[PDB]
Amino acid sequence: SGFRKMAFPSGKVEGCMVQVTCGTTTLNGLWLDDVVYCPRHVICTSEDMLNPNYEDLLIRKSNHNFLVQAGNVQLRVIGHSMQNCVLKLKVDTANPKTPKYKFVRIQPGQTFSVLACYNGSPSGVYQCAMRPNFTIKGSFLNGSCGSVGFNIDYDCVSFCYMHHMELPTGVHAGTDLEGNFYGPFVDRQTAQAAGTDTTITVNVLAWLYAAVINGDRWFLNRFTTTLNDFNLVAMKYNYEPLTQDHVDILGPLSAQTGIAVLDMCASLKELLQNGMNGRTILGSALLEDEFTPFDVVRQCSGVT
Amino acid sequence: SGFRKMAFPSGKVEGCMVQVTCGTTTLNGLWLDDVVYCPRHVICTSEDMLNPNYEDLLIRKSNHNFLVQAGNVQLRVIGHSMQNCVLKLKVDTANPKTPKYKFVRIQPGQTFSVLACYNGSPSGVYQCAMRPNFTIKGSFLNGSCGSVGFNIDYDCVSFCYMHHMELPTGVHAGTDLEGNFYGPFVDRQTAQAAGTDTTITVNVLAWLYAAVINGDRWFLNRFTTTLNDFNLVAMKYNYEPLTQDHVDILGPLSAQTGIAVLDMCASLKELLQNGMNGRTILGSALLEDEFTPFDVVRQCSGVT
Ligand SMILES: NS(=O)(=O)c1ccc(Br)cc1
Ligand SMILES: NS(=O)(=O)c1ccc(Br)cc1
């Protein structure tokens, strides 16, 4: 029993973190096989950051301009290319600790673990979601760029995020491991505003199920609703629309608890309209939206 | 910027987790040098759990009755002893991945990372505090016993907790790595009630400082207070008393923010009396008490 915001064990990813230096800039790289992945803005002077032309800045860089350090040993760079907003540095040595891995582009609402690193050294691990506005709310200081987000399926690390930048509002933006930004963000020191940070409805419902499973039942009401009726209230409260695909994903939690998805929707509806009234659910005074249905099943069943 | 509930990277501890089996019971063990540490209740039939005499149950066990598996290789048990509520199994092989480590008994309010494991396999990592009633609010299913709590000081893992049991209220109790329970709990399937789960005042203040540092300033008020005046309000709200030792520990956050500790106390005083009024601090609708002053400094400076 009990329900915690829980990150994947970080060991497999710790074994992949290196320090990348280009001139005076140091950030983090991901070493998989004989490639080190890092944000391309490693090549920028903070002067360059204001309006960088990366192709032109890259002409001025050779393999030997990229200093890659793994623990306290230097890796030989024998090649470099730009793929979208990431640099791929070919090194002469395959990472001996390379796990089984995939690169995956996640959807908004998908959760992942971040191993926050500085100088290629892991400092902490926390759980995030891709926000509906394709930002994440991370914890990232200067030097943290190249820190990665991931999921683990048993022994396969799916890398879904690389940290690139902080918006002036102090929310975070980054790429998949093919270097494509989540959302409309660019690696340029220019004012970029995030859209509406809506609540991930399917994630709230999953967490309401997690609450019932852990004995927090006070919010269970005597009502049901429909997707359309629920969605009208959702829209008004800046909740994401719930689709039948969401209802299907919630099926196993529905089955385990004997609470129909639309009944739990009607409970959430009343929580939005009535508020918490100073009560808590799983030790929270607001509705948590950074657990997926899969996260709740995983934690409430004990997958390793 | 941003502020997250952040666990230590778990890699160093992942390399220490083994499966321990005694008869039909499987739980987790910690393998450091040539010793495997596990909860002594590994020797109990759930029948035994109701009123176990561990010395008497242990007479019936030999070295060969303890099955220790690390990955999918069996370790040879060449010795076993009971120290308080843990078994120490001497094995013929020093753990090659043994990190630098200490065993430490933490104080209430101290935070730590838990690597939740099942069958010696890590499933997740989360951040906990030792509650003032010497319980923790964890996430632990059957098979999770022997899961450990830890802090990392650079390359030295301080092990502070081993998971033993769930109280009927679904909060958690365990030992240090010398097998001494935190609080008055015993490894017996008998009704045990926790005392008052008070709020860790010094931890709330640290997190209020973390909030100011990250631009959440709305709760900063025009008042100050004294330790005695603050403590009267604290007592009424089931907050732990604040001592000068707490004020001293908050000094560096005081210095960084230019907010005197007693001023921040007066802000917290108003938050207790006035409540949040539907506002959030660092994305929370209640006052967070599972960050220590040291945690806030570490995250707000970027220690690795
Ligand atoms: N925090 S900011 O000045 O908006 C900024 C945006 C993008 C980059 Br890449 C670097 C800095
Ligand atoms: N959950 S309980 O029945 O109170 C319990 C207490 C202690 C042990 Br050790 C096992 C079970």
Descriptive account of the structure:
2 copies of one chain form a homodimer. The first copy, chain A, is an alpha+beta fold. The first copy, chain A, is 23% helix and 27% strand. In chain A, helix 3 (201-213) packs across helix 6 and helix 3 (201-213) packs parallel to helix 7 (293-301). Chain A has 3 domains: 1-14 and 100-197, Trypsin-like serine proteases (Thrombin, subunit H, Beta Barrel), CATH 2.40.10.10; 15-99, Beta Barrel (Thrombin, subunit H), CATH 2.40.10; 198-301, main proteinase (3clpro) structure, domain 3 (Orthogonal Bundle). Chain A has helices spanning 11-14, 54-59, 201-213, 227-236, 244-257, 261-274, 293-301; strands at residues 17-22, 25-32, 35-39, 66-70, 73-75, 77-83, 86-91, 100-103, 111-118, 121-129, 148-153, 156-166, 172-175. The interface between A and B is large, with 54 and 54 residues. The structure holds 4-bromobenzene-1-sulfonamide (2 copies). One 4-bromobenzene-1-sulfonamide (T5G) binds next to strand 12 of chain B.
Looking at the structure, the CATH topology of the largest domain in chain A is: Thrombin, subunit H
Distance between the termini of chain A: 17 Å
The number of distinct β-strands of chain A equals 13
Spatial order of the strands in the main sheet of chain A? 5-4-1-2-3-7-6
| Share of β-strand residues of chain A | 25-35%
PDB class: hydrolase/hydrolase inhibitor
Keywords: SGC - Diamond I04-1 fragment screening, PanDDA, XChemExplorer, HYDROLASE-HYDROLASE INHIBITOR complex
Assembly: dimeric
Entry title: PanDDA analysis group deposition -- Crystal Structure of SARS-CoV-2 main protease in complex with NCL-00023830
